[PDB]
Structure formats: C-alpha cells, structure tokens
Amino acid sequence: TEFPLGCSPNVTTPKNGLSMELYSYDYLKSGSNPCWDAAYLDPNYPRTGYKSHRLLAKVENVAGNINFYYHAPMGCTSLFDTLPQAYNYRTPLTMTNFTMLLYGYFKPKVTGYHTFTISADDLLFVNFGAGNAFDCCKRESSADDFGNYQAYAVWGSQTAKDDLTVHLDAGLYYPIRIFFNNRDNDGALSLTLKTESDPNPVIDFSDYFYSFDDTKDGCPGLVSYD
Numbered sequence: 001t002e003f004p005l006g007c008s009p010n011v012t013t014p015k016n017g018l019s020m021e022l023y024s025y026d027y028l029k030s031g032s033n034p035c036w037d038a039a040y041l042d043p044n045y046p047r048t049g050y051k052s053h054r055l056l057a058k059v060e061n062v063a064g065n066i067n068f069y070y071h072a073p074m075g076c077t078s079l080f081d082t083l084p085q086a087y088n089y090r091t092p093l094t095m096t097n098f099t100m101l102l103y104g105y106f107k108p109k110v111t112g113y114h115t116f117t118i119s120a121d122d123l124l125f126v127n128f129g130a131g132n133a134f135d136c137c138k139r140e141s142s143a144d145d146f147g148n149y150q151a152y153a154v155w156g157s158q159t160a161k162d163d164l165t166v167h168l169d170a171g172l173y174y175p176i177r178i179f180f181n182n183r184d185n186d187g188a189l190s191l192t193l194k195t196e197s198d199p200n201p202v203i204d205f206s207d208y209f210y211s212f213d214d215t216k217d218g219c220p221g222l223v224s225y226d
C-alpha cells in the first residue's frame with residue numbers, strides 16, 4: 001500500500017515514543033537439535049504465540065535510535081546484556097534470545113515519499129498504516145488483527161533486508177507495529193528512514209514516534225487525496 005491511512009488524534013500534547021513489550025524466547029532443552037526454538041517462524045507467533053512466553057516488561061516512551069547490533073560471546077547459550085538507551089529498559093536481559101514488540105504511531109516531519117528500510121537478526125516484521133497495523137485510536141480492540149507485513153526481514157532467508165516506500169503526510173499519525181525476535185546468538189535490529197528531502201538516512205526517531213490513548217469513536221485521518 002503506497003498510500004497508507006493515517007490518523008488525526010487531535011490531542012493537545014501527544015505522548016512521546018512507542019510502547020514496548022518484551023517476552024522470553026527460551027532455548028530448547030539443552031540436548032535439542034537445533035538448540036533454538038523454531039516458534040518464531042510460525043505464522044501466528046507474532047500474533048498469538050508470543051503471549052505463551054513469559055512477559056518480561058511493558059515499557060512506554062521508546063524513542064531515539066532503536067538500532068543495535070549484539071554480538072554473542074558464544075552460540076546456543078543464553079547470555080545477558082542490555083538494550084540501547086532509547087528502549088527505556090536498563091536491566092540485563094537475554095540478548096541472545098528474546099522477543100520484542102513495539103507499537104504506536106509514526107508522524108512525518110515533511111509530506112512526501114518515505115522509504116523505511118529494515119534488517120534483522122533474527123526477525124523483524126513491520127505493519128504500517130491504519131487497518132494494517134491497527135485502527136486509529138482503537139489499538140486495543142484491533143491489536144491482534146494486523147494484516148500483511150509491509151516489510152519483513154528474516155536472518156538467513158532470501159529476504160533478510162526489506163523496505164517500504166510510502167507517501168506520507170506530515171499532518172497525520174501513522175499506526176506502526178514492529179515485531180522482533182532473536183532466536184539465538186547474535187541479535188540485530190536496523191530501522192532507517194530515507195525521504196526525498198534529506199541527503200542521508202534518518203536513524204534517530206525521537207521526534208517521529210508517538211503514543212495515543214484509544215477513544216470510543218476513534219480518530220480516522222482527516223487528510224485524504226483520492
């Protein structure tokens with residue numbers, strides 16, 4: 001979808017950053033082959049399956065540069081380390097093996113074409129736009145109903161890097177959902193943004209990520225171009 005639907009929350013001062021949920025991604029029993037759990041590849045793991053793992057935390061105000069590379073000292077071993085500052089989560093977690101969901105709204109600074117580019121170890125699935133990610137100011141009631149991924153990247157496959165080129169309006173806030181998994185060993189997440197305006201990729205999303213409370217009537221976007 002080249003013209004994704006946006007939202008018009010018309011809230012006085014919007015809340016900065018996305019919401020995050022972290023969940024466990026345990027290795028298989030210590031004599032299993034391979035050592036890692038393959039659930040991350042089942043089609044419903046990003047929808048229902050992650051909820052069968054342990055909730056590690058629900059965090060708010062995730063904003064900044066969310067990109068990271070984590071080098072595991074060794075493979076098939078659950079090891080602890082920390083996420084970047086932007087994630088608002090300071091305590092060590094199993095960086096070798098975990099699940100992470102981010103959701104909220106993306107607001108453009110300038111109207112025009114935006115190319116989001118992603119790469120991941122092991123997995124990054126992105127939904128973007130109302131309906132596709134979730135409904136405007138109706139996130140809780142549409143949370144699990146996200147459609148086809150607007151970008152997807154899986155380590156070791158024939159689509160390990162992906163992009164999404166969309167025409168966006170600076171007036172609107174766009175529902176976004178980002179689902180990440182590290183099954184084992186190294187972990188990495190790269191999201192960048194390229195517009196027809198700037199000369200280089202944007203990697204710091206501080207002024208771009210927002211959160212909005214759900215409302216009874218919702219907040220459909222009030223910019224349309226048919």
Ligand SMILES: CC(=O)N[C@@H]1[C@@H](O[C@@H]2O[C@H](CO)[C@H](O)[C@H](O)[C@H]2O)[C@H](O)[C@@H](CO)O[C@H]1O
Nearest residue numbers: 036074075076121122155183184185186187
């Ligand atoms: C198969 C491979 O390339 N590497 C194995 C290690 O695990 C993978 O490492 C990659 C990065 O190279 C990804 O992070 C992937 O998610 C991992 O599963 C594995 O842990 C060890 C064996 O102990 O070495 C490689 O076999």
Ligand SMILES: [Ca+2]
Nearest residue numbers: 121184185186
């Ligand atoms: Ca990995």
